[PDB]
Amino acid sequence: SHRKFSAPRHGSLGFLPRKRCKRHRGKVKSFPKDDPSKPVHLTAFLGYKAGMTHIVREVDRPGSKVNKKEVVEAVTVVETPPMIVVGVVGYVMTPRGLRSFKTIFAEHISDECKRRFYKNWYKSKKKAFTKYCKRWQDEEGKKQLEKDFSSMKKYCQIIRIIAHTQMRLLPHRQKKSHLMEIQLNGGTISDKVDWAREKLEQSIPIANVFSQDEMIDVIGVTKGHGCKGVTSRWHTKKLPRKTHRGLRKVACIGAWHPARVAFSVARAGQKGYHHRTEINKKIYKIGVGYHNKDGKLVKNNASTDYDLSNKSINPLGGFVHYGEVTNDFLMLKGCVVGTKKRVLTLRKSLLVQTSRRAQEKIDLKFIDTTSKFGHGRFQTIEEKKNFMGPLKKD
């Protein structure tokens, strides 16, 4: 009664249940272990999946058949506008896990950050943190505020900062900022509270958290596909054509005994929109957002040392279904979970990055900016008009 021929199981049981994530934003379930020898730094950041493109770079991989030769690798653009630290929270270690000790918010909290505190912001008197913000001015409030910071330096072992994204600087319809606790893994508790107290209601750019050619982890929710059958959800083999009552099913969902269906039997249900954590995503380029240097708009964040062009990371017509990346972006090798305009939770690696591929220094030679809204054949509009010449619209 053993199965005739051996075959590995369809799907992994370590991603159960295949349910919709109860949380749209990616959640850091494990921050890197604290190393007090380092300076105080952030360990995570929030980005937004703009879209994908391909680059060209010369690989330096001694021993490979592609060493000293150019490749074309797919990359993902993650628009990462600077986040504003509007709070700090301390955790105390307890024999039943970490526990929220006390949270301190800044005096001035942006309106986009307050929209997160509401479900109906348009018809709500925006009174969140209106009685709390008076602590930073009252004499009795500032004394109690100094005691709360000195209490975190005394009774806490893990200090996290509450930061939100600047949805105002994004093409999204959404105005609600995305709050997130970013754990400080720098040094002493006194150093992390002092660093968090100084960085309150201040912006933190993506270049200060992550570095070039660094492998980071991308946390987020995958793209949802609704209810899918067992052939699409678990990739079970399709039954033959002459199968009565359905061929996209699993034939045997279990033996006679045990007289129950096992949890490991592949069934039909919701596929996609699951929480996932992919690691070893190398940063190919930390872009710079649009800025005025001498009164002129600087949008050369896609030019390389070999292109010397004046094009931005946005392709012709912008990223499809997303918009244009006018802020600082993050170019990650390969693909990442989520749809377009999906909030991505970036995080430093928990592992050590010492392999040949991990510490590989990346030097891009060309960044494709052809229109992804079809078979785009021009990198810039300038060369589209130069190649085609004048049209009738002129």
Give me the amino acid identity at 131.
K
Q: Segment 284-313, which members bind RNA (CB under 7 A)?
A: none
From the CB of residue 45, how many other CB atoms can be counted at a distance below 10 Å? 26
DSSP string across 339-353:
-TTEEEEEEE-SS--
Query: Is residue 356 within the footprint of another protein (CB under 8 A)?
Result: no
For RNA, which residue of 58, 107, 278, 307 counts as binding (CB under 7 A)? Answer: 278
Q: Which does 167 bind (CB under 5 to 8 A by kind): another protein, RNA, Mg ion, none?
A: Mg ion
Q: Looking at 37-45, 164-172, 353-361, 366-374, which segment touches another protein (CB under 8 A)?
A: 366-374
Q: Looking at 189-197, 285-293, 301-309, 315-323, which segment touches RNA (CB under 7 A)?
A: 315-323
CB of residue 379 vs another protein: minimum separation in angstroms? Answer: 7
Q: Segment 237-256, which members bind another protein (CB under 8 A)?
A: 237
Evaluate whether 73 touches 57 at the Cβ level (below 8 Å). yes
Secondary structure letter of residue 301 according to DSSP = T
State which H helix or E strand residue 249 sits in: none
DSSP string across 140-180:
HHHHHHHHHHHHHHHH-SEEEEEEE--GGGSS-S------E
Answer yes or no: is 172 a known binding residue.
Answer: yes
Query: Is residue 368 within the footprint of another protein (CB under 8 A)?
Result: yes
Is the CB of 239 or the CB of 298 nearer to another protein? Answer: 239
CB of residue 294 vs RNA: minimum separation in angstroms? Answer: 22
- The structure tokens listed for 285 are 């380029």
Q: Which does 70 bind (CB under 5 to 8 A by kind): RNA, another protein, Mg ion, none?
A: another protein
Q: Segment 25-84, which members bind RNA (CB under 7 A)?
A: 25, 27-30, 51-54, 61-66, 73-74
Q: Segment 162-181, which members bind Mg ion (CB under 5 A)?
A: 167, 170, 172
Q: Where are the alpha helices (DSSP H) in 199-333?
A: 230-233
Secondary structure letter of residue 95 according to DSSP = B
For another protein, which residue of 71, 98, 350, 381 counts as binding (CB under 8 A)? Answer: 71
CB of residue 158 vs RNA: minimum separation in angstroms? Answer: 9
77 contact partners, CB below 8 Å, separation of at least 6 = 49, 50, 51, 52, 53, 287, 313, 319, 325, 329, 330, 331
Assess whether the previous peptide bond of 258 is cis (omega < 30° from 0).
yes
Is the CB of 37 or the CB of 94 nearer to RNA? Answer: 94
Return d(Cα 80, Cα 50) in angstroms, integer. Answer: 10
Is the CB of 16 or the CB of 72 nearer to another protein? Answer: 72
x/- contact string, 352-391, with Mg ion (CB under 5 A)? --------------------x-------------------
State which H helix or E strand residue 216 sits in: strand 215-221
Dihedral sign for Cα atoms in the order 163, 169, 171, 174: positive
Return d(Cα 106, Cα 201) in angstroms, integer. Answer: 6
Q: In angstroms, how far is CA 117 from the centroid of its own chain?
A: 22
CB of residue 230 vs another protein: minimum separation in angstroms? Answer: 17
CB of residue 265 vs RNA: minimum separation in angstroms? Answer: 5
For another protein, which residue of 377, 382, 385, 386 counts as binding (CB under 8 A)? Answer: 377
Is the CB of 195 or the CB of 322 nearer to RNA? Answer: 322
Q: Segment 211-250, which members bind Mg ion (CB under 5 A)?
A: 244
Enumerate the β-bridge partners of residue 85.
163, 202
DSSP string across 110-141:
-HHHHGGG-S--TTS---TTTTTGGGGTSHHH
For another protein, which residue of 21, 52, 56, 169 counts as binding (CB under 8 A)? Answer: 56
Evaluate whether 152 touches 189 at the Cβ level (below 8 Å). yes
Is the CB of 173 or the CB of 293 nearer to Mg ion? Answer: 173
Three-class SS state of 14: helix
Three-class SS state of 305: coil
Return d(Cα 103, Cα 156) in angstroms, integer. Answer: 11
CB of residue 54 vs another protein: minimum separation in angstroms? Answer: 4
Answer yes or no: is 372 a known binding residue.
Answer: yes
Query: Is residue 140 within the footprint of RNA (CB under 7 A)?
Result: no
Is the CB of 40 or the CB of 343 nearer to RNA? Answer: 343
The footprint of Mg ion (CB under 5 A) covers: 167, 170, 172, 244, 372
The footprint of another protein (CB under 8 A) covers: 5-7, 54, 56, 65-66, 69-72, 237, 366, 368, 370, 375, 377, 379, 387, 389
The annotated binding site for Mg(2+) is made up of: 167, 172, 372
